[PDB]
Design a protein around this ligand. Structure first.
Ligand SMILES: COc1ccc(NC(=O)N2CCC(C)CC2)cc1
Ligand SMILES: COc1ccc(NC(=O)N2CCC(C)CC2)cc1
Lengths: 193, 193
């Protein structure tokens, strides 16, 4: 079970580097995984379900990395604190660009992909707002915008900006500049009065 | 010519308030415009071409409003200067939410829609960077990030945040909060050291 499922998922991630999900057949997935087509349908109903599982894996990888960071004591340097956090997403999604690209596109056509992304964005926004609230409570950040509203716009900026950078969209921030760009906007907007 | 073309465009904008372009037929468009199907094909090749023209109209409306603002002397109050500028996009796109929603979705499936949006984003980013550069030259803004990179992330934030707000996505900034939210992040990031 585990082994043939993992092989299908690995094959899908590899083929999505070359082409979009529309141009990948179940035959391609079964062939890559060394199984028959009917055996593929035992593990997944569709190529779309495979992408959902890949995206779920990547999103939970980012979330579990963020939880690991949240568990350790807080970085005493506020800019570095936020940079290490944004970097979890930069490195996790940047290490899975094909799944990232395909998953964002699938939000349009898949309610399960749209709901997965929504769910995790709400969790990441809530956490961001809780950190901003803690910074205000300790007198390290000014009481300016509603923290949850600020957190929402900053998280949406990172969603759009990181995906544009990884896809090489025109326009985009160069990948080698995007972490510095986003940290600057987070720190100035969280700590600026 | 002008009159039947305008009627098709008006019908399309009206029907997109009720449903997506996928659920609107050429019959629906011709019927709404008081023409036959074959007469529709004289003016446009597809329902997709109608949406392209609607989006083109809206994007050029925003751009021409921004040009009008760019022509007048600069607002002496830096926060108000940026607020009046962001408000051009808030009001223009917010007044055409059905075309906005349908056009953003069509970027996925239409190279002409994707190129239209890209073209105008590059123009708006260039203008933003030129204003930031002028603010630095006059000693009103600090020389922090590369202006074009800062401008790119701020414009992508507005793209994603305003569209989420107008679509009522979860998550989103409430529409009644989104202008204040974005102005705060632009002003703190442009003027913060
Ligand atoms: C590609 O999509 C996203 C990429 C990044 C984000 N969010 C973040 O960077 N953080 C920064 C650190 C914070 C404590 C949690 C949120 C959201 C979406
Ligand atoms: C919905 O998509 C966008 C909505 C807004 C923008 N950009 C802007 O707000 N401005 C602010 C003022 C500046 C001088 C030009 C750019 C881009 C995309």
């Amino acid at each position: 079970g585990d082994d043939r499922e993992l092989a299908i998922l690995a094959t899908a991630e590899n083929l999505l580097e070359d082409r979009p999900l529309a141009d990948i057949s179940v035959d391609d997935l079964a062939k890559g995984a060394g199984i028959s087509r009917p055996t593929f349908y035992f593990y997944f109903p569709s190529k779309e379900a495979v992408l959902l599982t890949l995206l779920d894996r990547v999103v939970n990888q980012a979330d579990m990395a963020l939880q690991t960071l949240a568990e350790n004591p807080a970085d005493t340097d506020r800019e570095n604190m936020w940079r290490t956090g944004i970097n979890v997403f930069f490195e996790t999604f940047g290490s899975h660009k094909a799944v990232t690209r395909a998953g964002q596109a699938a939000r349009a056509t898949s309610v399960e992909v749209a709901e997965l992304w929504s769910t995790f964005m709400q969790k990441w926004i809530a956490y961001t707002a809780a950190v901003i609230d803690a910074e205000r409570d300790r007198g390290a950040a000014p009481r300016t915008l509603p923290a949850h509203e600020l957190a929402t716009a900053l998280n949406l900026m990172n969603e759009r900006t990181l995906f544009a950078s990884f896809a090489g969209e025109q326009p985009s921030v160069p990948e080698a500049r995007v972490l510095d760009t986003l940290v600057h906007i987070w720190v100035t907007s969280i700590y600026g009065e």
